[PDB]
Each structure stands twice: as structure tokens, then as C-alpha cells.
Structure 1
Amino acid sequence: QIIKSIAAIRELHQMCLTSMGPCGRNKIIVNHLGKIIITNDAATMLRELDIVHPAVKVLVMATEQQKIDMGDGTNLVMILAGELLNVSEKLISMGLSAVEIIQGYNMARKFTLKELDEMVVGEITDKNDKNELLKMIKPVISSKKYGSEDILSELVSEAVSHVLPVAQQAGEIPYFNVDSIRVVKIMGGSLSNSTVIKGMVFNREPEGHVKSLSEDKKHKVAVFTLDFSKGEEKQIDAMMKEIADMGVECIVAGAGVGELALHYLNRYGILVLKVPSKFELRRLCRVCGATPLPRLGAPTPEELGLVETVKTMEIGGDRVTVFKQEQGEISRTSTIILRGATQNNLDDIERAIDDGVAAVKGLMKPSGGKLLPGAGATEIELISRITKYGERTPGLLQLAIKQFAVAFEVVPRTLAETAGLDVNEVLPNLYAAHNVTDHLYKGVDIDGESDEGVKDIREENIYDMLATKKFAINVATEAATTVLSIDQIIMAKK
């Protein structure tokens, strides 16, 4: 139950050790269809991974809940819920019931929330200018691929500034969304060749005669939902002419369009959108403001959209549709053009941007996230506070309080394994550093030179979000007690 059930989790607990840390690594997973997925995020792997033991699915769904809601630093807390079940092995011989186990972690969890507010520093009230965004990207790189931290620094910060409704004074949590920023996969080119376009880019190849003019502008978008043969020639010629009379440069049609209708559209050079997906169709409704009209006819300006200009260029060698606004008011519109060699590196940067953009959305939603030491720095002072918390209120629950502090020792144990450092040497170094203000700006140093000394987090700028830290403990503790609260594993009939 708890046993074999926890031992089965220890197999994935030791396998996911490389999923976190600046020295962390990725893994290879194969589904039933043969598709390979190489990524360092365990939330994506466990989603497609077939789970046998029933209670393990609860642990998987608990970690996926943090990815949907928070999605920031989930790799660091991914194994946090696994160690909570490991420290319960010592409580087996002691004879502590699951009631005292839940009460021990619940009382220590609420005490931890009060300690995070006392040690929090660096309140950020801006959340707008890119200088505050560059400091938020560094901790994202600490939990992700360490290859290049310079490229993603200017790539993500520039895209957030474009989608941000920059104005004279923007208060009251200006609107920000993850779906507002899309990453376009372009095969070929170095990672440093990735640019940022303030508009929206579509993936498709036009028939020809691409628009060669820019400064002229004046572009519009229209979104749409023997005698018998001679009649179709007059009707199509009339319907295509009435649309061109309104100056419609681009037509969005979800239904089928024959080659005869596309012939008259080539007279004025009218491009058509062949993407059946509703993501690109509904996005233009919030920007250009076009209402889908099932009939063709002569769409009124109420159903017609407004786009800056249309230009087709070859990025990775193929023609793609790129809508870019050179000069003008731009709000809630932006995109990221990603240049990569193989799809293996494209998915790694995709998860970096998806969690990077979600980190900004998760930061702006609360009043503030401030700053908290990350990369296992905060958990060092927590052990000292929890140790004194158990001796503060002696009793039967004090033994469970000590096990709750040992559960935080897996984070420094994991960081030493990814970097090859000896945990036996590093543990007293951190025990002699943060323990007896010099402990607020100090953190553990992970590098080949860490044997000489331990550098602080001030120059490294490695931090953690206070909003996600409070919610990560709440989910990990509740999920751990939920597995322990399961009485028995019984199948279901029919």
C-alpha cells in the first residue's frame, strides 16, 4: 500500500532528479505510437506515460495541477511531493497513525507560510519595464536548459514588452495572457537568429504574387464562415468583385473554396487563409475586429477587419505569412520567431517560453510576487526554523515536525547529484553558512569552482517566486497526505 507504492514512486523520484537544477538534464520517453519526446519537464512526460499503480495517478495529477495554474518552477518542486512519502518510512516503526502525520504536516505548513513573509525581500512594484523582466528570466533558466541564457533573456523580455499595453500610465494590473504570444517553429538557423515581431505570423505558403508594397498600407481583412454551369461563372465573378470593391486584401474563409473562385482573387492579389484552426481565426477578431459572415456578398465595414500591412518573406527558406506593424499603436499583439536546428531543441525552448510567459502572467495576477531565494537557498533557513518550531511545542507531533524538515533536504541532495558535488561535503558548508543579516542575500553556488567557496545569489540573480512557493507547499503536502489517507486499493465493477 504505502510500501511497494512508495517504492514504485522512488523509481520515478530518482529518475526525475535530473529534471531540476542548473546542471539538470532531460530524458527520452516513447509512447505506444513510437513518437519520441525529449524534454526536461516531468509534467509532459508523466502525461503520456502509462501509469499502473492507481495512487501514482493522484501524484501525477497533483503535479499537473501546478503546471496548469502556476507553471513556474514546477521542475524544482516536482520531486518535493516524493520525499514527503519517503520520510514516512521511519514513522512506520515508531507507530504514528496517519492522523498525527497529517496534523504534523498541516501545522508546519501554516507555520511555513508565516516564515516566507518574514524572510521575503526585494519587493517589485513595477512588473512592466524589461529591467525587472530580465531578473525574472534567470531563475527560469536555473530550472531549465543551461546552454544559452543570453538568447532567451532578450527574446522573452522583448516579446512581453510588445504585448504589454504600454501607455502613459497603465495601472490596475494591465491585461496579460499566455495565448497572446505564439512561438512559430522555423527549422534551420542558429538559436541566436531568433527575432521578435510585434505583429502576428501565419504558417502557410501563398500561391504567388505576394504583396510587394509596404508604405502604401491600406489593408483589410474579411473573415468568412449547361445553363447551370454558366450561372456559376457569373455568380462567382459577381461575389468576388463585390468583395474586391471594399478593398479587402486578405480573406479568411473556413469553408471550401474552389480553384475558380481563387482565380478572380489573383487579379487584385488577394491572399486567402488556408489554416482550418480556429486559433488564428479568433485572434484576428480581437485585433482586426472582423465578424464572420457565412455569405459572400459585399461585406460591410462592420464585418471587415483592419490590418497594418501584409508582407511575405522567407525566414528558414520557405515563404510564410507575416503580419507586421512597423509604426503605430500596438496592444495585445506580438509573436516570437524561433530559429532552431532540430525539433528536439525546438521543444526545449518551447517549454522555456511557455513557462517563461506563464511566469509573467502568474506574477502580475497577485498584487506582487516580490523575491525569494531560489535554487535550494530558502529551504536551508527553513530547516532551522522548523527545528526550533518542534522544540517550541513539545509533544507527540514533534517527531512529525522533524520529518517535515528532513523532507526539505532532498533539494540540496538533488543539486549535488546533477553537478557531481558530494552532498556530504556541501551539507555542512550550507549548514555553516546560512546558520549563525547575511543569510538573505546568500545562496548555494552550483559550479565547478564551488569547491573553493560558495558565491551568493546577488550577482547570480537566482530567485524564486513567493506566490508559487506558497502554492507548491500547499499542493505537495495535501497530495502526500492524500496518498497516506487512502485506506485500501480496490478495483471497480463494470
Structure 2
Amino acid sequence: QNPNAGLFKQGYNSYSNADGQIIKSIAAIRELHQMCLTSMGPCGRNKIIVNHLGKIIITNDAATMLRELDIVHPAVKVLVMATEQQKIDMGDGTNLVMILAGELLNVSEKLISMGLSAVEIIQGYNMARKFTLKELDEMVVGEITDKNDKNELLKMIKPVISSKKYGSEDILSELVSEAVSHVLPVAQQAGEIPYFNVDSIRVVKIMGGSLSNSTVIKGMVFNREPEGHVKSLSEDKKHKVAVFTCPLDIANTETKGTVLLHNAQEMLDFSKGEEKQIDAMMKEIADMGVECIVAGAGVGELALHYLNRYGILVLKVPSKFELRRLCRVCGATPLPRLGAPTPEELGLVETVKTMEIGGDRVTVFKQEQGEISRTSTIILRGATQNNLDDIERAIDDGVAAVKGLMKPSGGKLLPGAGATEIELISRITKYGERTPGLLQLAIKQFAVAFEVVPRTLAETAGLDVNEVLPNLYAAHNVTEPGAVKTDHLYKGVDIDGESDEGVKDIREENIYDMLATKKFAINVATEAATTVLSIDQIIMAKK
């Protein structure tokens, strides 16, 4: 009976702003916002994810939370896609984009209810962004000087480790800083040569114990033991390394090359061929001075026999990607053929040794004070599978963040622990009051959205936000005898598990944020919120 009207596309559930879809889109986003809101901060919360492979993950990582959800609704897809942009172009800012974008949409609900159009809201937000970006350039207090010393790397690494692993910073910071300073050279006054490849630091894990047993290796670690009799190389320098992909046995054709034996004489002659061909093949390898042979495939019994006679270290690497990385350190090229050990394809290594970590034997390819690898390995330990995996992610953040310290304006530091956002709220608001016309409505709300950071930092720490927030504002809500605001730009949010009236200073813990991270994340969050607010219809065709 009841007639339908207004929907002419198909049998559907009409999604038009005529029924307040602009609010429904925001309300839908609120679900994922509340999820990520509990992650940010040194005292954030864990999430349990059940993988389709039956793997249980308990982690703080917000990207995992979003990536492991199957998401359709366009409104959240804008913010999730924006989050992925933050993951690709920046080594940090994941929670900043998702949380801020949601909060910009949350405050828009009042502006929309006020009767302020989506265009008028967006126009003010774009103005507030332009004001915010300019302020971030001027709110800078410290600077990384691109010296890449341990003390300088630790200054940045410490806050990067926090908000994922708090209380473990003393160990985790040393693990990253030592790995970085090993592979990251000191350089200045030149931008032509890139530094700090994302593959420059590998992380591996061994079960058992806890993080206190972690260390750093000056080179690459392989899970395989030397298959030959030689278990290590001598202390002699510049060992020649021959790398193969084809199984090491009787010489054969790169493609197929399988010999069939039917006659008694064929078996007799083939068997002799195995001994003669393998020996001569290994002879040439030895005659070139090769002391280590690395195979991507198995090594036959005779191949091992003759390789032992020639004193050549025999190490299998079943992973082609590990070999591709090894080629970047030793300079060797794998031979896909068998019996063609061209000397041009040989590499060099200073030391290859068998070592035991937790009882598990591994092989290390490393150097001491020469021909030094640009790839290092961080050794993680732990008896709990979940925590062991989660620490690996914490190390990844340490490594990824250092990438941001490179040429593109990674130096500039801002006081962290919410101190930046608290100042931005005051500065953006004043711009709102100065801005004529209706633009002030959205510019002021743009500032309001930023309080989520000092609010989340307090809430996750168990503090009453209704007492912490007014104290945080009072600390910055000061009048100074001058145009330049100074003398205390360090007042942040405490995350202590014990009572402490007032606030601590950033300078006490050296918690600084990167300018590039703050400017980029806020820029991305504004684009995300801008897009969602502009949507007044969802269009779909029946499948």
C-alpha cells in the first residue's frame, strides 16, 4: 500500500542528504573513529584480531585494525584510504590522520545542525588548514642537525617507540639506534645521494626469554646452518663468494637437462660423469680463490664431498629475496646455470660465522671495520609469540620514522605530548575571531577538533579529562610581555600511572614530534574530512 517516492535509481535504500545523509555518513564513521581513538598515546589500548588464517593478534597498531576490516561504505573508505596514504608517504601519523579526520567530522555535526552548508563548512576548514600549516612552521622549537650520532638518533627514536611499546623504550631504542648508526652514514651539505634504504635494517625473531636478551648484528642473519664440513670462514679478509641458484650436482642444462639411463653402460658412464664433472666444477671454483659458496638450492652428496675437500663454506639460502638482499652486500650475482662459475659474478665477505641464538643456530654474513654492509639485523627474543611479533612492529616504526629524518625537511621539531595541539587550538581560534563573516564558525570548530589529542592522552592514562584539560589550557592560556610566545612552550600531557598535580615539561623527557609528520598528517586529515562532508548521495548499481 504505502507508496514510494524520491527513489528512481533501483530498488535500494535511498541515501540522500534530504534525509540527513551527511550526518549518517559521519555517524557511520564514528564506529571506526571510536576504535582508533583508543589506540593513540603512550597508554593506548590493545585490540584482538582473529586472522582468517587462525592467527590471533593482540596489538596497538591502528593500521592493522583498519586493514583487517572489510569496508564498503564510501564515507569511511575516504578516511581509510587517507590512512594508507599516511602509511606510504610518511613513517608516522597513522592515528593522527584517522582520529583528527573523524573529530573534524564530529564537530561538523554542530555546524550542519546550525544550518551551515557543507560548502561554507569546507571553505572555513580550508582557511583553517592554511592558518594551521603556517603556524606549524613557526611553532618549531628544536631541530635535528643531521649528524646521525647515537644521541641524536635516540632523541627521535624514543618518542617513536612510545605509543606502541611503553616501558620497553630503554631496550627498543638501543636496538634501533645501534642498527641505524651502523648502516646510516654521516653526511651533510649534499642532496644528490639518497640515504637509509627501507631494507637497510632487517628484524628477525627467536622464541624464548624476553626482550632483555635482544641484540644487534652488524650484517645479515640466515636461518640455515652451513651444510658443508666448514662451519665458518677464517679471519682472512676479502673472502670470495660464489652464489648459485641451480642445484649443485653433475653439470646440466639450464632448462631441463635431465639424463635418462636405460642401458647398463649408460649407468656406468653417467656415474663416472657425476664424479668427474662435479670435481672439475668445484675445482674451478676453488682455483678462483672462492672460500664460501651460497646456493639457492640443494647441494648433492658429491658436491658436498668435493666442496669439503676444497675447504669451501657451503651455505644454503632457500629464500630468493634473502639472496637478492645478499647481492647488495657482497656484490655477488647468482648463477642460474650449473658449471659456469664466471669470476665476474663473485662477491666478497669479511666474516661468515655460525652462531647460536636461544639454541637456534644461524649463519651471519658480516664485516668488522671494513667493506662494511649497509644492511644490519636486529635480534628480537621472547617466549610469548604475540609479544614477539608485536615488538617487531615497534622496531619497524623506529626504522620507518628515521626515514623521515632525511633531506625533505625532517629536522624541525615541535613539543609533543599534545603541547603542539594545545597551542594550535589557541592560535587557530584567534584566526577565527579575526576572520570576517561566516568562515569563523568552521575555523573555530576546526580548532576544537584538535583537543582530541590532549584528551586522548589523558583518557588513556586513566586521568579525569575534565580536570586535566582545563589545566592544560591554563598552562598555555598565558599573556606574555612581548609578541613572541616563549619561556615555556613545553607544557604537555602527563601519562604517569601515579598522581602528579599539574603537568610535566617536554624538555624533561625530550618528547618531540616531527614537523613533516604534523603538517602532512593534518593536511591529509583535512582532505579526508573535506571529501566526506561534500557527499550528499551514494550511487550503486545492483549486482
Asked whether the two chains share a fold, i.e. TM above 0.5, the reply is: yes
Q: 1:484 to 1:210 in 2, by over 3 A?
A: farther
Conserved? CA contact 1:26–1:39, under 8 Å:
yes
Distance of 1:298 and 1:45 partners within structure 2: 50
Cα distance change on mapping 1:349 and 1:234 into 2, 3 Å: same
1:2-51 CA-partner distances (Å, limit 9, x unpaired)? 33332232222222223111111221111333221221111123112222
Indicate conservation of the 8 Å contact 1:242/1:298, yes or no.
Answer: no
Q: Is the 8 Å Cα contact of residues 191 and 339 (structure 1) preserved in structure 2?
A: yes
TM-superposed CA distance for 1:229, in Å, is: 4.0
Question: Secondary structure at the residue paired with 2:476?
Answer: coil
Task: Please give the alpha-carbon distance, in whole angstroms, between the structure 2 residues aligned to 1:237 and 1:251.
Answer: 15
**1:452-493: CA deviations, max 9, x gaps?**
221111111111000110000111110111122233222246
Which of 279, 296, 318 does residue 276 from structure 1 map onto?
A: 318
Contact kept in structure 1, 2:491 and 2:504, CA below 8 Å: yes
Cα contact 1:237–1:264 (8 A) shared by 2: yes
Q: RMSD between aligned alpha carbons?
A: 2.4
Alpha-carbon shift at residue 201 of structure 1 (Å): 1.2
Distance in 2, matches of 1:97 and 1:115, equals 27
Of residues 76-85 and 304-313 in structure 1, the stretch that sits farther from structure 2 once superposed is: 76-85
Q: Please state how far the C-alpha of 1:373 moved relative to its aligned partner.
A: 1.2
Deviation at 1:320, TM superposition (A): 0.4
**1:216-266 CA distances to partner (integer Å, 9 max, x unpaired)?**
455221122x43443333222322222222232332333554444334323
Q: Does the residue aligned with 1:338 lie in a helix, a strand or coil?
A: strand
Identical columns (%): 100
Counterpart CA distance in 2 for 1:251 and 1:487 is 65
Instruction: Kindly indicate whether the alpha-carbon contact (under 8 Å) linking 1:243 and 1:297 is maintained by their aligned counterparts in 2.
Output: no
Q: Report which stretch shifted further, 276-285 or 352-361.
A: 276-285
Q: Distance in 2 between matches of 1:326 and 1:358?
A: 26
CA offset at residue 170 of structure 1?
A: 8.2
Q: Decide whether aligned partners of structure 1 residues 489 and 256 sit closer, same or farther in structure 2, where only a CA change above 3 A counts.
A: farther
Deviates more, 1:379-388 or 1:171-180: 171-180
SS in 2 for 1:215: coil
What per-residue deviation string (whole Å, max 9, x for no partner) do you get for residues 372-405 of structure 1?
A: 0112111111111111111101211111112101
Change in 2 beyond 3 A, CA 1:94/1:168: closer
Contact 2:219 2:375 in 1 (8 A): yes
Cα distance in 2 for partners of 1:416, 1:442 equals: 14
Is the contact made by 2:229 and 2:313 (CA closer than 8 Å) also made in structure 1? Answer: no
Check conservation: 1:444, 1:455, Cα contact below 8 A.
yes
SS of residue matched to 1:67: helix
1:129–1:161 contact (8 Å) kept in structure 2: yes
DSSP 3-state at the match of 2:333: coil
Aligned residues of 1:165 and 1:330 also touching (Cα < 8 A): no
- Checking the alignment, whether the CA contact within 8 Å between 2:46 and 2:60 is kept in structure 1 is yes
CA distance in structure 2 between the partners assigned to 1:208 and 1:287 by the alignment: 23
Q: CA deviation at 1:450?
A: 5.0
- 1:99 offset after TM fit, Å? 1.3
Shift of 1:212: 4.7
Q: Is this contact kept in 2: 1:244–1:268, CA < 8 A?
A: yes
Judged with a 3 Å threshold, the aligned counterparts in structure 2 of structure 1 residues 486 and 267 are, in CA distance, closer, same or farther, namely: farther
Q: 1:162 to 1:490 in 2, by over 3 A?
A: same
Question: SS of 1:217's equivalent?
Answer: coil
Worse-matched range after superposition: 389-398 or 238-247:
238-247
Is the partner of 2:49 in helix, strand or coil? Answer: strand
- Measured in 1, the distance between the counterparts of 2:76 and 2:541 equals 17
Deviation at 1:95, TM superposition (A): 1.9
Between the aligned partners of 1:252 and 1:172, the Cα distance in structure 2 is 34
What's 2:502 paired with?
Answer: 453
Cα distance in structure 2, aligned partners of 1:86 and 1:243: 69
Equivalent position of 1:139 in the other structure: 159
1:359 Cα deviation from its structure 2 partner: 1.2
| Aligned positions, number | 493
Q: Distance in 1 between matches of 2:100 and 2:78?
A: 15
Task: Please list the CA deviations of residues 111-141 of structure 1 after superposition, one character each: whole Å capped at 9, or x if unmatched.
Answer: 1111111111112223411111111122113
1:424 alignment counterpart: 466
Q: CA deviation at 1:427?
A: 1.4
Q: Is residue 217 of structure 2 the alignment partner of residue 168 of structure 1?
A: no
CA contact (8 A) 1:142 1:375 kept: no
Could you tell which deviates more after superposition, 426-435 or 344-353?
Answer: 344-353
| CA distance 1:236–1:493, change in 2 (3 Å) | farther
Judge conservation of contact 2:240–2:346 (CA < 8 Å) in 1: yes
Cα distance in structure 1, aligned partners of 2:25 and 2:305: 65
The 2-side partners of 1:274 and 1:475 are apart by 46
User: Post-superposition shift, 1:368?
Assistant: 3.8
DSSP 3-state at the match of 2:229:
coil
> Is the Cα–Cα contact under 8 Å of residues 310 and 322 in structure 1 kept in the other structure?
yes
SS in 2 for 1:444: coil
Conserved in 1, the CA contact under 8 Å of 2:419 and 2:490? Answer: no
Unaligned segments of structure 1, at least 5 residues: none
Match of residue 480 from structure 1: 529
Equivalent pair of 1:165/1:174 in contact (CA under 8 Å)? no
Q: Contact (CA 8 Å) 2:178, 2:216: kept in 1 or not?
A: yes
Deviation at 1:172, TM superposition (A): 6.4
Judging changes above 3 Å, is the alpha-carbon distance between structure 1 residues 202 and 239 closer, same or farther for their aligned structure 2 residues? Answer: same
Alignment of 1:388-407 (within 5 A): 388-407=430-449
Segment of structure 1 superposing worse, 142-151 or 235-244: 235-244
The alignment partner of 2:274 has SS state of helix
**Worse overlay, 448-457 or 81-90:** 448-457
Aligned to 1:102: 122
Q: Is the 8 A contact 1:222 1:251 kept in 2?
A: yes
Aligned-pair distance for 1:163?
A: 0.1
- Are positions 1:293 and 2:335 aligned together? yes
Q: CA deviation at 1:333?
A: 3.0
Q: Are the aligned partners of 2:36 and 2:99 in contact in 1 as well (CA < 8 Å)? A: yes
Could you tell me whether the CA contact under 8 Å between 1:17 and 1:418 is conserved in 2? no
Change (3 A) 1:371 1:168: closer
Matched, 1:212 2:254: no
CA distance in 1, matches of 2:351, 2:384: 31
Which range moves more in the overlay, 74-83 or 164-173? Answer: 164-173
Change in CA separation of 1:120 and 1:168 when aligned onto 2, cut-off 3 Å: closer
SS at match of 1:480: helix
Inter-partner Cα distance in structure 1 for 2:73 and 2:397: 29
Structure 2 counterpart of 1:469, from 505, 511, 518: 518
Q: 1:244 to 1:331 in 2, by over 3 A?
A: closer
Q: After superposition, give the CA deviation of every residue in 1:132-162 in whole Å (9 maximum; x if it has no partner).
A: 1111122113322113221012211111111
8 Å contact kept, 1:430–1:444:
yes
Pair 166,222 (structure 1): closer, same or farther in 2 beyond 3 Å: farther
Q: Which is further off, 302-311 or 274-283?
A: 274-283
User: Which residue is equivalent to 1:304?
Assistant: 346
Aligned to 1:190: 210
Q: Distance in 1 between matches of 2:542 and 2:35?
A: 34
Give the CA deviation at 1:76: 4.2
CA apart distance, 1:268:
3.5
Whole-angstrom CA distance in 1 between matches of 2:39 and 2:76: 18
Tell me the equivalent position of 2:477: 435
Name the CA distance, whole Å, in 1 between partners of 2:189 and 2:442. 51
Query: Is residue 227–residue 316 contact of structure 2 (8 Å, CA) maintained in 1?
Result: no
Residue 363 of structure 2 is aligned to residue 321 of structure 1: yes
SS in 2 for 1:371: strand
Q: CA deviation at 1:174?
A: 6.1
2:426 aligns with 384
Match of 1:149 in 2: 169
Residue 47 of structure 2 contacts residue 58 of structure 2 at CA under 8 Å; is this kept in 1? yes
**Residues 76 and 143 in structure 1, CA contact (< 8 A), matched pair in contact too:** no
